[PDB]
Symmetry: D2
Subunit: 314 residues, 4 copies
């Protein structure tokens, strides 16, 4: 029958932004000093809008704020080196949005002279300058995804032995039915796909994850499939809060055993940038005969041209 | 010699969005039912990005959150009617950004079914439906400004007798000299004008304010001139934090007594919408012989065409 | 067989501080200015309160609202609280837990002392009725004075269950003392495992373990209150009103009674984190325990006098 | 004429609780395991504490300890006891006295709740540690409190070492308004400078109390160095005297050299940590210049209540 492995190969013509995992890989191989300078240059070169509000994150930022410049620079080398320190382990314990807010606060303090700057006239190594040109050449959604993915990977491995208790964020209540937008997708009336996108746009992660088969999977961009409603809901709650999915176009094809493959293309806006960064996205669904989601992949596309790439099975 | 009044008339061909103060006046005329309905349609029709995290505003938001729907509505009517109640007096005490964050939280709660909705089947009064239509046609910058000035004037007069102690926000440290961007303006090299714009983009209001005469004046769009370095400093700290001024063009003209008048056009972005709303702005400066600002007007322009009307 | 009403009459001679409800009743029939003047005399003639609840966001914001008001508007809010007027502030106050209401008034008293909140007017004279109340309070013992002040400020603002009430605020549930670090009480005259289990659980804030000692339809009757029936309601009361209580029982009698039930009376003192070892309240616990050792009924009484700690009359 | 040096010897009979610095010193010679065991055994006979480290830096570092596995929590406490150079120890050093005490209070409450690692089961005090515990068990209440306070305040790093972190500041409490102040009454004494000092301190009016000192006047707290000059005295009062209640009972006034007066007062001090539970037995020894300004005041924790009656004139 159908497996997660076979579902991953649906719509083979979908062109993803492989510049993202390429640059994240190159980035990760630089020394601490290059990584930090790249983060500063990448950040500065780029319209962000903001949480590290929570008491643990706020207090560790206050610890950094009271340190002399030399001790602040050491904390940042430790995060970029993935060193074993309590600050690195606490950073590992942070949810994605707290990691992002943590870095955003350090960037603001650097610009205010509160946190040690990159050393004036600092010289990017050859490999680092290459990485920065790679980032400059990428589109807006690719640039944000490289920055996000790079800072997320800093500090210690969060599942290594002796890991600290993972921080919990409040579940934001969903938009009430009466106030939800309903998407229209040119060429698609599939109730499961419309249900998924409408529930996600409402932050209704309970209703979105209920559409999944108990052993179904969600594959985020450039990640492994996340299997089962418990782990999918956890991913949605941590990584999909306030995403706005603006689907444009789709194709639906019956496949073997009464399953249906549906491809949708459109834009996703993140609360981090609002209407200033539309990420070019594809959703690839495999839907079972009962209308349960067996698989969905979210792909960051190479360019806006890929929004028009809806090729039927040959 | 110049006065604030005579300074106000510099660059007379400048076309300001009088739709904004118009629609704002219609809005103020409406009953509370129609005012709340319009706010809600505006907040739904329009990509906002954010505050009222401060203890007073947070606790008052929690008070509204625990009320039944009927008492929540009554509070919101009291704000629209500018009634004399502790909640209205506290709201009047808030800074501009706390008032905006307060209303933003109520709109998020209404969308989540935590705060009473506008009744399905509530129908706008005729006038209200006109006011709403007038807003839909106006451009983004003008819509944001209507929405801003409407909610800022809710609750009580902040300077009335019996007013509550005004709340204060933390003064944000300016951008450090090394990390500041310097603007270029086609057709302009005035050091005072460039110094004002660069200091404001760094949130360095002490440096911007030092560019004015003792009794120098700043006139925000559709407002009374603010007179004196202390009142200007107070206004910049409350209303200009995180504004990004993106001038494109300007003209300079010598006038009487060795004064200079300079008009600059371009865009301003606000942190509330970031790069998603560039408001269309002119700055009109009257500069004294020693290079001190006597007067500067900030004007919200009729349309993107006024960006070219320097003449 | 036993009912809540029959259980209420166990150990008939237990003499209770009836001056508390008397004085609480009289306090509330005074006008607002007298009520405020009397509270101010208490906070001053009793400045050994060790603390605060009201740190929580709602209570902190409403305090900041009162802080920014002019003296005339602050006095008006306190009159509204004393008059139990229908206002958002009085409805919010009504929604507070006991400890938040007490911390709220505590902050207002400190702010009055600091010149931040409008004081009782210079040389205010208590009406004759108010001087009678102050006199009764003065004649009452420490444990009784603490209860009158507590029960008086709790009853201010609006009826918390009136139509149009605001959602009740919730306090974080404090984790219990772990078993290895608990004190066990020893009570002279008593080895009843249920009674000891109850007192040790409460002194550890283990309200889940205390409530599990009750029958489904078991009741807890706090001083001068209606019985609270069932494990949900009793747990909600313990969480709100028993946090950090120290029960120092001294002596008890146990008696077998009809149907294989045992009745147990215990006397002792209770300390509250508001006053610590300062104020020991003279308390009797009256327990009716079923044949399985589950609690059917327990009354907590504030006793009329310290004599009552020896009144353990059997029959 | 008078020096801080000669002032220190006024009222030579006055017997102080020398057991306090004895035990503090003994305690600090023990290894980290004995130190933590003793803190727990001492704090366990002291649940009549009635209370802070509310402030964002302290709360976040407490949340950091709370999320740590037991092994890591114990290592942080060994670092504090060993005065190791770690960011946590440097932050701890930066704290005010009351934040240091609130920090240790939170860890004690967490230990009692099973949230922080206990003293290992069966743990056995070294011979020297059992000698320290015995001395603590024998000390009166005021002396036990003082030993615990001074012990925990001296943990973490040297707050004035090279590489120190920015000192945290606490909010200054508004004083009691004059209409609501108490006036003390002292048997034997109507000295307006002594009464003015005590009444001002009881109102938290540190500015008025400091204005009673000579420019180069000194305040000598129990078992500490003399604090010299109005700015230093004001900083000390703001940090360590908030909410103290002085209850002087008896005193003697003697005219001495150079137009000076010396005044000895005995009575009690209550602390907001303990309230009316613990009244510590205190003497105040004032040297007052001819203009009525304090040249020197020592506050002594007395050896026994018998010292309350040691008021002899010569």
């Amino acid at each position: 029958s159908f497996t997660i492995q076979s579902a991953q190969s649906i719509f083979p013509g979908t062109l993803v932004a492989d510049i993202v995992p390429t640059v994240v890989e190159s980035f990760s191989q630089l020394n601490a000093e290059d990584q930090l300078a790249l983060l500063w240059f990448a950040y500065t070169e780029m319209r962000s809008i903001t949480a590290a509000n929570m008491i643990l994150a706020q207090g560790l930022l206050e610890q950094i704020k009271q340190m002399p410049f030399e001790a602040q620079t050491q904390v940042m080398y430790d995060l970029a080196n993935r060193a074993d320190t309590p600050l690195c382990r606490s950073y590992a314990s942070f949810t994605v949005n707290i990691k992002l807010g943590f870095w955003y606060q350090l960037g603001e303090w650097m610009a205010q002279g509160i946190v040690a700057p990159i050393p004036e006239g600092y010289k990017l190594s050859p490999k680092a300058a290459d990485v920065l040109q790679a980032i400059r050449n990428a589109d807006s959604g690719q640039q944000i995804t490289i920055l996000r993915n790079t800072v997320i990977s800093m500090g210690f491995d969060p599942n290594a032995p002796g890991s600290y208790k993972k921080v919990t964020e409040p579940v934001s209540p969903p938009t009430a039915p009466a106030f939800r937008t309903k998407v229209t997708i040119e060429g698609i009336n599939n109730a499961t796909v419309l249900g998924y996108i409408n529930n996600m746009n409402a932050n209704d992660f309970d209703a979105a994850v209920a559409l999944f088969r108990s052993e179904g999977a969600l594959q985020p961009p450039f990640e492994r499939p996340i299997v089962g409603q418990d782990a999918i809901r956890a991913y949605m709650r941590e990584e999909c809060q306030g995403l706005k999915m603006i689907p444009e176009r789709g194709i639906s094809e019956p496949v073997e055993d009464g399953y249906t493959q549906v491809k949708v293309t459109g834009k996703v806006q993140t609360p981090w940038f609002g209407a200033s960064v539309g990420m070019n996205i594809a959703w690839r669904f495999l839907i079972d005969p009962q209308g349960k989601i067996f698989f969905v992949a979210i792909d960051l596309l190479a360019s806006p041209k890929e929004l028009l790439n809806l090729v039927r099975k040959h």
